[PDB]
Design a protein around this ligand. Structure first.
Ligand SMILES: NC(=O)c1ccc[n+]([C@@H]2O[C@H](COP(=O)([O-])OP(=O)(O)OC[C@H]3O[C@@H](n4cnc5c(N)ncnc54)[C@H](O)[C@@H]3O)[C@@H](O)[C@H]2O)c1
Ligand SMILES: *C(=O)CCCCCCCCCCCCC
Ligand SMILES: [Zn+2]
Lengths: 302, 6
């Protein structure tokens, strides 16, 4: 129930792997963020140097955060579209970490991937809509913002607009056409809430990859798991701990290291390497290598 | 609730 039992034989990658191949581990939820797509050429926000916050000087905006806030987008969409042009990859190639999740799906272990990313790489790796909660939406589709229109446009249309440097307008009514992303200030999709209500009732492992767990309400997903569900973080830095200050005012933060630690494991490094290591323990390494090479070769030949 | 930093 709400008891804090220890189901990992040890708080290591090796322990997680053994658990994953026990009968108790049938339903895995992945929570992922921008860290899983940095090796695919898309910057995160927070990384020193290569993160976007460091690299937004030219846009002459108040504080680097505004270009992804809904009120600033409403005032002027042009900076956002300009940056989208700058960031739009020539080629969409999912990472090892993406294909690791594809392996979970093919093995019948994936209950859901909840992603904060908007880059569509989960879809390209072969996660289906069913499998996915795009908690912050997606560039995959776009919609005219006009309540009485709401015409849908595909990414090839939006891409053309973004590269032509033409602010996207609706062909039916000439209102702005906006990528289906959730800007800061916006409500998350209803899907997010209903999947969360059901999925966290019966999850056996939470795998958390490439996110700082600072964006809410996404971050609070870690507290929705049962207290005995193991949680593995694969990330360059620890994340999701309780802050010693905020934590003094009235969910289960990550606890990898304290005296009371019983189910949380942190593997610090590149997501691609951590997933590769985990795959190796599970005996999936060659499968993973073959999938990535074949999928990448297939993309390379488009 | 709304997308937001903490
Ligand atoms: N790819 C995208 O769709 C994209 C890109 C940037 C930002 N965002 C948005 O901005 C917000 C940022 O949230 P976030 O927590 O995803 O990003 P973040 O920038 O806040 O943090 C990313 C985390 O991943 C780590 N990291 C980065 N590269 C890594 C790698 N290769 N291996 C392991 N760890 C790595 C960072 O150290 C950090 O902890 C979200 O709302 C998201 O929607 C999306
Ligand atoms: C929430 O955090 C809003 C998400 C805004 C981040 C967008 C960053 C990347 C945009 C360009 C990539 C295009 C991929 C189709
Ligand atoms: Zn329209």
């Amino acid at each position: 129930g709400s008891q804090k039992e220890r189901l990992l034989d040890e708080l290591t990658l090796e322990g997680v792997a053994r658990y994953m191949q026990s009968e108790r581990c049938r339903r895995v939820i992945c929570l992922v963020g921008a860290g899983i797509s940095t090796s695919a050429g898309i910057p995160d926000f927070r990384s020193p140097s290569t993160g976007l916050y460091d690299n937004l000087e030219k846009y002459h905006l108040p504080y680097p955060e505004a270009i992804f806030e809904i009120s600033y987008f409403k005032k002027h969409p042009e900076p956002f579209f300009a940056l989208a042009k700058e960031l739009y990859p020539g080629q969409f190639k999912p990472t090892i970490c993406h294909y690791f999740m594809r392996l979970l799906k093919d093995k019948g272990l994936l209950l859901r991937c909840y992603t904060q990313n908007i880059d569509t790489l989960e879809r390209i790796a072969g996660l289906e809509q069913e499998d996915l909660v795009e908690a912050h939406g997606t560039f995959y589709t776009s919609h005219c913002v006009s309540a009485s229109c709401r015409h849908e446009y595909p990414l090839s249309w939006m891409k053309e607009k973004i590269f032509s440097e033409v602010t996207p307008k609706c062909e039916d009514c000439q209102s702005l056409v906006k990528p289906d992303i959730v800007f800061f200030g916006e409500s998350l999709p209803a899907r997010f809430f209903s999947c969360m209500q059901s999925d966290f009732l019966k999850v056996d492992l939470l795998l958390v990859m490439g996110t700082s767990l600072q964006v809410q309400p996404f971050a609070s997903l870690i507290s929705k798991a049962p207290l005995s569900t193991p949680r593995l973080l694969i990330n360059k830095e620890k994340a999701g701990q309780s802050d010693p200050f905020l934590g003094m005012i009235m969910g289960g933060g990550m606890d990898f290291d304290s005296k009371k630690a019983y189910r949380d494991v942190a593997w610090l490094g590149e997501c691609d390497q951590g997933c590769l290591a985990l795959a190796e323990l599970l005996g999936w390494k060659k499968e993973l290598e073959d999938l990535v090479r074949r999928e990448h070769a297939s993309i390379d030949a488009q | 609730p709304r997308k937001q930093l903490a």
